[PDB]
Design a protein around this ligand. Structure first.
Ligand SMILES: CC(=O)N[C@@H]1[C@@H](O)[C@H](O)[C@@H](CO)O[C@H]1O
Length: 526
């Protein structure tokens, strides 16, 4: 039987800094009785270290007579991963959507989940069930399978099953649906203004299908839905959205997680401590506070004070604790195993790598062409390769060794690969224009050129050179084509993963045919 402080602690999931458990992590577990830990890149160096860290955190909880921990992560696949060293880089959602095959979304998720569970991670903040029907969406993009409820539901429920079959709790996000937003809830408080009929047929549909089949957790969106909530409360803080729609109309009695409370949509308009209280009042079970210890303690203190002041009832707290304990039992989070990972070990296998390679071969999409495009192996090839230099958690600094140039080189092509910034410098732009005068076969890999004017201008400049045969292949959002009216040949790869660049190289050299279908619209749908 848990004390009040232990019950309140169960409602919080916190992050920390460390490759081994830090003093902050130790106090969160032993003194604040936190229910969960979320990992970021700072916690994840290699498989042996992660597995050791998860076992250490569980040991700290066990030896202090605390409930075993949920341990989560944002391992969505493709362009949103927190660990690539020693694990399979799996295609992401929109790459899977373009391949169109629900069975491949299962296998992709099962690889992710199998490897996570081997590292002691028992929860994943995935899959996104957001439907990216707005090509301007600045935060979802290729994190969505595509622009229709049918495709997102079909692939998304199989991803849930692949995660949970591997022993990892799936968390569908971001309820009731972040795909339409033109604004980013990291930075602002977005609104989805549409009528209930539209939410019922689009936004809500994949969440309904996931709930019907059994999903361990649902994460909310820090987004206003005036058709559901008349007050200026995002879904995370709205009893209309959570208790009313999710728990009531949709019958969901599983774990409801807030999106990160440190995001501007909450922290700037409502505050972390009072947001924590309001999230529980709205119907959430698990309060996510990913980064700052001060804000984690503020949420814990505010939740305790709210119970002690009579604002949150005893039954209400027990209700969430019951859902969290049931999930923890269901995923056998107290289970142990022999150590099988030592420093230097990898979970990558030939079989899993070749499986995801075959997925990406089905994903590459041709959006525009004027005739033959395949590279002439007897001539040099200039590859323009973009790299993220200023990062965020949606768009991370994430270096890739297996570039398009890497794969073209492995095929015997004479490649000059030039790396430039996603916002290229003036010198990089001048350097590319100069080399294009010496190498007429040019492939630009674009990377959200639709959001990077200097990148798009360079591409449009190359497209206007009559001495240049230019191919553009987008390695993040496929909507770049909307900003590139002069480009004659445009491919979408939906990510810059090793397997996507391998498949792209095979397409450009005529070794495989294009099979992908653009899974989200180039213009917003209603
Ligand atoms: C809209 C959005 O991207 N929200 C993300 C969420 O997906 C992620 O699970 C959480 C924890 O890292 O951080 C939020 O910023």
């Amino acid at each position: 039987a848990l004390t009040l402080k232990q019950k309140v602690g169960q409602l919080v999931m916190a992050g920390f800094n460390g490759l081994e458990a830090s003093d902050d992590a130790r106090k969160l577990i032993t003194e604040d009785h936190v229910g969960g830990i979320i990992y970021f890149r700072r916690n994840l160096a290699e498989p042996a270290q992660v597995a050791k860290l998860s076992a250490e955190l569980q040991q700290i909880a066990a030896e202090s007579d605390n409930v075993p921990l949920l341990i989560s992560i944002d391992q969505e696949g493709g362009m949103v991963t927190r660990l690539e060293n020693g694990v399979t880089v799996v295609p992401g959602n929109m790459a899977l959507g373009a391949a169109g095959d629900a069975e491949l979304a299962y296998e992709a998720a099962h690889i992710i989940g199998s490897e996570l569970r081997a590292l002691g991670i028992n929860m994943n903040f995935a899959p996104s069930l957001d439907i990216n029907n707005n090509p301007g969406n600045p935060v979802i993009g290729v994190r969505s399978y595509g622009g229709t409820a049918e495709l997102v539901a079909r692939l998304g429920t199989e991803a849930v099953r692949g995660f949970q079959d591997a022993g990892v709790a799936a968390t569908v996000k971001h309820f009731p649906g972040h795909g339409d937003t033109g604004e980013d809830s990291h930075h602002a408080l977005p609104t989805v203004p549409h009528a209930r009929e539209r939410l019922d047929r689009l936004e809500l549909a994949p969440f309904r299908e996931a709930i019907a089949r059994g999903v361990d957790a649902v994460m909310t969106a820090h987004v206003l839905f005036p058709a559901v909530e008349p007050e200026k409360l995002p879904a995370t803080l709205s009893s209309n959205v959570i208790e009313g729609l999710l728990r009531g109309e949709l019958g969901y009695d599983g774990v409801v997680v807030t999106d990160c409370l440190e995001m501007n949509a909450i922290s700037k308009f409502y505050g972390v401590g009072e947001g924590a209280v309001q999230a529980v009042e709205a119907g959430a079970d698990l309060i996510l506070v990913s980064h700052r210890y001060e804000r984690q303690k503020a949420a814990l203190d505010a939740l305790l004070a709210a119970v002690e002041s009579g604002r949150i009832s005893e039954e209400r707290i027990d209700r969430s604790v019951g859902r969290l304990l049931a999930l923890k039992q269901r995923r056998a989070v107290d289970a142990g195993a022999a150590v099988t990972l030592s420093s230097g070990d990898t979970l990558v296998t030939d079989e899993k790598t070749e499986l995801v390679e075959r997925i990406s071969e089905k994903s590459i999409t041709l959006l525009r062409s004027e005739g033959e495009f395949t590279l002439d192996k007897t001539k040099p090839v200039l590859v323009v390769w973009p790299e993220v230099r200023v990062g965020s958690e949606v768009d991370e600094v994430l270096p890739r060794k297996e570039t398009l140039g890497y794969w073209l080189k492995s095929a015997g092509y004479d490649v000059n690969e030039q790396t430039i910034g996603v916002q290229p410098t003036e010198e990089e732009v001048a350097h590319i224009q100069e080399l294009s005068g010496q190498i007429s076969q040019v492939v630009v890999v674009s990377y959200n050129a639709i959001f990077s004017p200097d990148q798009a201008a360079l591409i449009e400049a190359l497209a206007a050179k009559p001495d240049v045969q230019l191919i553009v292949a987008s390695a993040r959002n496929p909507f770049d084509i909307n900003a590139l009216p002069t480009v004659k040949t445009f491919f979408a790869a939906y990510e810059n993963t090793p397997s996507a660049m391998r498949a792209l190289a095979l397409v450009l050299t005529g070794q495989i045919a294009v099979q992908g279908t653009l899974p989200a619209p180039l213009t917003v749908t209603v």
